[model samples]
Target: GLSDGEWQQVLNVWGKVEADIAGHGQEVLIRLFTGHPETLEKFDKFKHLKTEAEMKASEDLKKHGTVVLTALGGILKKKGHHEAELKPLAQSHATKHKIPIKYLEFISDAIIHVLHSKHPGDFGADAQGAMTKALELFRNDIAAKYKELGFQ
Candidate 1:
């Protein structure tokens, strides 16, 4: 949970992130998929791509990547009081996609990495710490839902 001040700064940080959603989204996906190839294997559109260049050139990857960022943005915009907002996505991933919980953490890792890379000055210690906490809660909320759905 974010302290009140941290919540404000988190939104401040998110303002910077919201500006370049699609590009940052794609970069985060690329970073995650690059670091963990198996995670990419879960994505039907991205798993077939053989190379980083191919991934970079992928329209479907870009679309899905943008959706990922947009979904997280939706949560952040509500100042992290987003359990209901997160529910459907978690349920779908658990029940429909059968995606493992670990991959969600990979997304969080990639988001933080990409944000730091793109906005080192803006995402200072305060912002980074706040965002990290928010992401922790975000991941846990989804994990709880996943377990409730018996999908791990």
Candidate 2:
């Protein structure tokens, strides 16, 4: 949930940076995996991609980063109404990916940390709170779906 002001700030900053999706996406992924190295175990495909340079050169990493950041940008655009938009991801992550909900929660936390670090001027306390609230909304719904689907 975001106040109109908080929402505007996020969208504004994102609009400016998202043009460089490749750059923003790469950094977010790098920042996240660097901080939480253990999570890489979730993606067996990246097992061989050891360094940041390797990830940068790998199309797999960039494509994933694009998708992740693009979805995040789209969510930011919504300004509050988000769960409906996030439903497919929630469903797929639960039913298809079966990636336990705790991991999903951690993903958003990692993304927020990356964004906050990248743009502290814009993503200050309130903006960070807004982003966290929105992501938690997604996480909670997805976690419930995972529960209903008999996923851990």
Candidate 3:
């Protein structure tokens, strides 16, 4: 559903944002949790963190956030669901993590917010829509894999 040049654009934008992965990744989780507290239920590590400050203070939370960015970093450079990095990640998120598809869609808000914060003028509505679609495709991969393994 995506073109080669479109995929490359995703990488180019992500390449710039990756430098601040520590801050960007942290912000994504915090935004996700701030906007949707229920997601914390999946994380025994940080479920007790009831506030943004608490989650921010936890090195453990930061570590997991970094892993998300690292995993994103691995997949961002490639193309669509066929991306080499997608399979294991999809399986892990499906079975091991049990992360819901909706969370993936919801977190796109944070991803776009972070990109806007970093790139300022560059991440306008057009880029926002593009980024949103790209993330959904990644989420679709996980959701598809989730279904394949006998879960809904």
Candidate 4:
């Protein structure tokens, strides 16, 4: 566990990650996080493991967790789900990733803003395409990170 000061630094890191996800449309990542509870569970399981495999798994879980959670939040916003539920999940993941929680909060706020600002008209195929691209970017980033870490 981190000391209070260290935890603050972790929060700061989480904040940056959250902001990047929100500004860059990393909604797919959010989806993955909220969609799969098992991943987070595994992350908790490996928290105390000292083996290389455990470290690798922990790293993979962190990357994927962020992506999935971000994506989920975006989807919920688009689908008009209550932002309250979605925001906390994003914030939790930011903390899990040892990043600042502020970014996650900001992203959630942005999602709500976007959903309310647009008219109740159809977003069309272009919007769907944009979402797909965002997911793909998130997927690629995780894959690259896993490879870089030598994790299968």
TM-score for each of the candidates: 0.92, 0.79, 0.86, 0.29
User: lDDT ranking from best to worst?
Assistant: 1, 3, 2, 4
Give the count of colliding residue pairs in each prediction.
Answer: 0, 0, 0, 25
The candidate that wins on lDDT is 1
| Consecutive 10-residue window with the lowest summed lDDT within model 2 | 1-10
For model 4 the TM-score comes to: 0.29
Question: Please, what are the lDDT tens digits per residue for candidate 4 over residues 1-152?
Answer: 22344334433433444665533233332332344333334355444644434544454545654565565545433323334544554444444454333333344444433333442344334443443344343333434444444542
Per-residue lDDT tens digits for candidate 1, residues 57-133, read: 98887788778888888988787678789988988888888888888888788888998788766678887888888
lDDT of 2 by residue, 30-121 (tens): 77677778767768887787898898788878888888888877766776576677778778876776666776666777777777677676
Stretches of candidate 1 exceeding 4 Å from the true structure: none
Off by over 4 Å in 3: 81-83
lDDT per prediction? 0.82, 0.73, 0.78, 0.41
Candidate 3 pairs with clashing backbones? none
Better of 2 and 3 by TM-score: 3
| Candidate 4 ranges beyond 4 A from true positions | 1-35, 40-121
* Candidates 1 and 3 compared by lDDT, better number: 1
